[PDB]
């Protein structure tokens, strides 16, 4: 939250849809990280259909900027709530105010040139406290297309990969939910037909020595971009209306 403020941060946090504002005031029957159930007062409440407002909180999901957006309950089990009060905080909002960052202990003084122009010199306490840590949500997609040579398969059967490679994929070829991945890991196995290599001399000779059945299928599989490393929080599968859904889907 800001240690030093104006008094507008509240208005910003609330007026922006990121927070969760109680439609009607009352007592919280139920508080869960997933959802919040509030029992309405009789004065605010309409005569029929009786009683409660249930707010389903948005959980970890992709934002437009590939950042994360996650709501947390700011209230407690069995607590009085006023109408128009924050029932939850969006990302970068604290207790109904607006927190865009973190306030910290800062000293103004030249330190050994390590802050030479505007350059900032930060302690280890900060990187360890994980306070300036940030969570990214990246949406990767794998496309099974139709080429004149044949349809592309999402199958987990991938030419030229070890057991360590095919491990992280289920039987169908899609990575398990929650499995941590880094650059090069196969998220979705994809194979596309390319028949008849038209191999040459010594290559041929080589295949003759080692006896390999070099495949009629090229590897198109979607793998994690180089250098980016994260955990899979979700998987979706879209299918043409009328094509048979694969095992995983």
């Amino acid at each position: 939250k800001p240690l030093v403020g104006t008094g507008m941060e509240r208005a910003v946090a609330v007026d922006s849809g990121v927070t969760a504002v109680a439609k009607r005031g009352g007592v919280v029957q139920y508080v869960d990280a997933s959802r919040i159930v509030i029992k309405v007062n009789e004065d605010e409440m309409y005569p029929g259909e009786a009683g409660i407002d249930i707010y389903n909180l948005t959980k970890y999901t992709r934002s437009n900027q590939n950042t994360c957006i996650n709501q947390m309950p700011c209230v407690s089990l069995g607590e009085p709530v006023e109408r128009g009060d924050v029932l939850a905080d969006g990302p970068s909002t604290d207790l109904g105010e607006l927190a865009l960052g973190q306030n910290m202990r800062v000293a103004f003084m030249p330190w050994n040139g390590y802050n030479f122009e505007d350059s900032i010199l930060v302690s280890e306490r900060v990187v360890q406290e994980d306070r300036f840590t940030t969570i990214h949500i990246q949406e990767l997609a794998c496309v099974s297309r139709d080429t004149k040579l044949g349809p592309e398969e999402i199958t987990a059967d991938i030419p030229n990969v070890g057991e360590a490679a095919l491990s992280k994929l289920d039987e169908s070829g899609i990575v398990y939910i929650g499995a941590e991945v880094t650059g090069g890991d196969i998220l979705v196995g994809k194979v596309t037909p390319k028949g008849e290599t038209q191999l040459t001399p010594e290559e041929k000779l080589l295949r003759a020595i080692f006896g390999e059945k070099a495949s009629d299928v090229k590897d198109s599989s979607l793998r994690v971009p180089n250098g980016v490393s994260g955990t899979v929080i979700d998987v979706q599968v879209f299918t043409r209306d009328g094509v048979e859904k694969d095992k995983r889907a």
């Binding site: 030249p110 802050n115 122009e117």
Partner: protein, 50 residues
């Protein structure tokens, strides 16, 4: 910038401080005088130099 504030703060003189008006054999024991806290970084002093 930082560097010039460094050399400027190094070489500037105040009117009075620790080590004012003493005499030293050379720069070596001048630095040696300063680092140990006996003589101020900036004080008017006669020193032998080559």
């Amino acid at each position: 910038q930082d560097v010039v504030l460094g050399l400027y703060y190094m070489t500037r003189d105040c009117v009075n401080a620790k080590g004012e008006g003493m005499v030293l054999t050379g720069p070596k024991e001048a630095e040696r005088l300063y680092r140990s806290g006996l003589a101020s970084l900036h004080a008017r002093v006669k020193v032998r130099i080559t």
